[PDB]
Amino acid sequence: PGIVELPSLEDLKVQEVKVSSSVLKAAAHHYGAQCDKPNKEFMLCRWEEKDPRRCLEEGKLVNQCALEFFRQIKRHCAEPFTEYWTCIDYSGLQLFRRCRKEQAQFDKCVLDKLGWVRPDLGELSKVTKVKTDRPLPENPYHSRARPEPNPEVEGDLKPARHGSRLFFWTM
Amino acid sequence: MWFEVLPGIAVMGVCLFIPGMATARIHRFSNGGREKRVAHYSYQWYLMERDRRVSGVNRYYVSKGLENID
Numbered sequence: 001p002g003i004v005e006l007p008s009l010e011d012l013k014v015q016e017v018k019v020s021s022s023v024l025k026a027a028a029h030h031y032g033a034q035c036d037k038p039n040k041e042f043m044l045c046r047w048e049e050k051d052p053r054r055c056l057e058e059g060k061l062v063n064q065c066a067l068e069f070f071r072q073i074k075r076h077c078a079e080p081f082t083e084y085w086t087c088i089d090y091s092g093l094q095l096f097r098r099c100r101k102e103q104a105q106f107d108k109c110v111l112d113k114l115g116w117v118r119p120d121l122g123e124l125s126k127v128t129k130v131k132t133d134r135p136l137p138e139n140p141y142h143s144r145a146r147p148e149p150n151p152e153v154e155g156d157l158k159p160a161r162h163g164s165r166l167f168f169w170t171m
Numbered sequence: 172m173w174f175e176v177l178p179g180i181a182v183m184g185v186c187l188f189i190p191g192m193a194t195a196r197i198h199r200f201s202n203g204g205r206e207k208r209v210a211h212y213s214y215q216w217y218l219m220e221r222d223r224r225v226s227g228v229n230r231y232y233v234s235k236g237l238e239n240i241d
């Protein structure tokens with residue numbers, strides 16, 4: 001069949017978010033609050049195109065928005081954030097319930113200096129709506145032409161011509 | 172009298188104290204002074220292998236924070 005069409009290595013180069021999973025988990029709720037729109041454009045493009053090769057520009061916008069998010073954290077509230085993700089990072093399961101005072105420090109400094117509000121319980125799990133400008137994929141499964149079905153039955157059901165026609169049975 | 176049973180119970184209690192304190196100090200020794208990462212589920216393992224990739228020294232416990240970005 002056809003040759004698979006991959007993007008080049010220069011199409012995949014982007015400045016990475018080189019932070020740990022506890023760093024990402026510490027500012028996860030503010031990341032969901034502040035980086036909503038390009039992330040949801042990307043995940044809508046990802047569930048509609050069903051192809052990661054059709055989602056590279058949206059992923060690059062995701063990475064750019066995440067980098068601007070952590071640069072906006074680092075300029076204003078770097079030390080309460082470091083105090084908070086170190087305490088998140090200590091735990092094996094990385095509990096949020098173990099670190100509520102460092103969370104209160106980080107959320108206080110973030111609300112005072114950056115105006116960000118941490119979302120309530122239930123908000124990040126909402127199904128939102130996304131205003132895209134790309135067209136809707138007309139055939140994302142690349143489904144070919146379907147086979148035409150067998151013809152249905154029609155007409156009034158007349159009696160059997162001369163019965164069963166079973167050798168001599170006249171009915 | 173009855174306190175004569177206490178040296179044996181004390182030795183048995185030290186022998187029960189050694190495995191737990193030992194594995195706690197070993198999990199803090201092999202993980203950078205922290206708890207061992209519990210990866211019961213595949214998302215926790217994906218985050219853990221992402222830590223192993225972003226640390227650069229093939230160790231998940233090397234935490235990289237805001238100093239690793241510009």
Ligand SMILES: CCCCCCCCCCCCCCCCCC(=O)OC[C@H](COP(=O)([O-])OC[C@H](O)COP(=O)([O-])OC[C@H](COC(=O)CCCCCCCCCCCCCCCCC)OC(=O)CCCCCCCCCCCCCCCCC)OC(=O)CCCCCCCCCCCCCCCCC
Nearest residue numbers: 156157158159160161162163164165166167168169170171
């Ligand atoms: C307004 C409302 C009121 C209207 C009223 C109208 C009616 C008035 C009269 C009232 C009574 C009606 C009776 C039924 C209608 C007539 C049926 C008929 O004669 O068909 C001829 C039928 C075919 O001949 P035909 O000249 O082409 O058709 C003339 C008509 O158009 C026949 O019409 P057809 O073309 O539409 O027939 C359709 C088709 C025509 O037939 C065919 O297409 C051929 C295939 C038939 C079956 C062949 C099977 C062969 C292998 C098995 C053999 C088994 C052993 C034989 C018997 C051993 C002894 C029991 O019939 C069948 O296939 C039915 C199966 C056979 C049963 C026949 C009816 C029996 C009714 C009484 C039962 C009493 C016991 C009888 C003995 C049991 C065995 C029959 O003849 C045979 O098959 C010969 C076998 C004997 C038939 C039975 C005769 C009926 C009267 C028996 C009275 C004496 C009983 C004595 C005591 C019991 C035995 C010891």
Ligand SMILES: CCCCCCCCCCCCCCCCCC(=O)OC[C@H](COP(=O)(O)OCCN)OC(=O)CCCCCCCCCCCCCCCCC
Nearest residue numbers: 177178179180181182183184185186187188189190192193
């Ligand atoms: C996790 C913790 C586990 C701990 C397990 C052990 C619990 C008990 C701890 C020790 C308690 C005291 C033990 C005393 C042993 C008996 C000593 C004794 O009386 O030895 C006398 C015997 C003869 O001496 P002799 O020179 O002939 O005397 C003439 C004097 N005019 O001399 C001899 O027989 C020679 C010397 C023998 C010395 C034996 C010492 C005890 C060995 C027991 C094994 C376990 C020890 C602990 C191991 C873990 C810690 C290092």
